[PDB]
Design a protein around this ligand. Structure first.
Ligand SMILES: CN1CN([C@@H]2O[C@H](COP(=O)(O)OP(=O)(O)OP(=O)(O)O)[C@@H](O)[C@H]2O)c2nc(N)[nH]c(=O)c21
Lengths: 171, 36
């Protein structure tokens, strides 16, 4: 019985599957929660990577008790660093999504208390990877997360990294 | 199994900060796959 390495926070994996008949809130599915590096890999090892999940699906990793919704109290005044990706390699997509997951569970950002979670959208035309932030009105924290995001993910130039307030996105 | 930083969490010195690099997080997956 070996000791596992605990994470600073408890994270929950959500999986959304599109359905014309259902409402967006009902498309979401809570999968599981974890709080160690080993239990993260155990989960990641048995789930489909983003490059294999059905068209119109989302993966979301959010801290415990924060639903991946604007309506959630943690995200009401928040925003999201959006990364839009043109039709590219599957390997590049999965690697980019994994790197985001590792930044989150590893607490790569100085303002850890500012991080809510991350969402990847599979839409065929263009895949989007977003990192949800707690306070969109604080440009300081948003930009700090932005630079760490550009560096850590090694984001290429002329790769769209844009921030949006959730209030504006509802429009 | 891996190199730990001074202020980082570990079994010994368990008061450290629960923060992990990319490479460190990658070292910790490998213990299951490699073994029989
Ligand atoms: C994050 N979302 C997304 N969403 C619903 O999903 C739609 C957004 O689709 P997405 O999930 O943003 O991917 P995309 O299809 O790329 O968005 P768009 O097509 O507007 O660019 C919105 O029109 C809205 O109806 C939401 N609806 C509610 N009530 N709460 C939420 O937090 C969210």
């Amino acid at each position: 019985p070996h000791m596992k390495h605990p994470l600073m926070n408890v994270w929950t994996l959500w999986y959304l599957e599109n359905d014309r008949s259902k409402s967006w809130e009902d498309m979401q599915n809570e999968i599981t929660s974890f709080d160690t590096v080993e239990d993260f890999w155990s989960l990641y090892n048995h789930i489909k990577p983003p490059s294999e999940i059905k068209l119109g699906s989302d993966y979301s990793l959010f801290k415990k008790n924060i639903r991946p919704m604007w309506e959630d109290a943690a995200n009401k005044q928040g925003g999201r660093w959006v990364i839009t990706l043109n039709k590219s390699s599957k390997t590049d997509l999965d690697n980019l999504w994994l790197d985001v997951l590792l930044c989150l569970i590893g607490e790569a950002f100085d303002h850890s208390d500012q991080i809510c979670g991350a969402v990847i959208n599979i839409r065929g035309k263009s895949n989007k990877i977003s990192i949800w932030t707690a306070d969109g009105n604080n440009e300081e924290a948003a930009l700090e997360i932005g630079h760490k995001l550009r560096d850590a993910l090694r984001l290429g130039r002329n790769n769209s990294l844009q921030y949006q307030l959730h209030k504006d996105t509802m429009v | 199994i891996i190199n730990y930083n001074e202020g980082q969490w570990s079994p010994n010195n368990p008061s450290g900060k629960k923060q992990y690099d990319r490479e460190q997080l990658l070292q910790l997956r490998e213990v299951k796959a490699s073994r029989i």
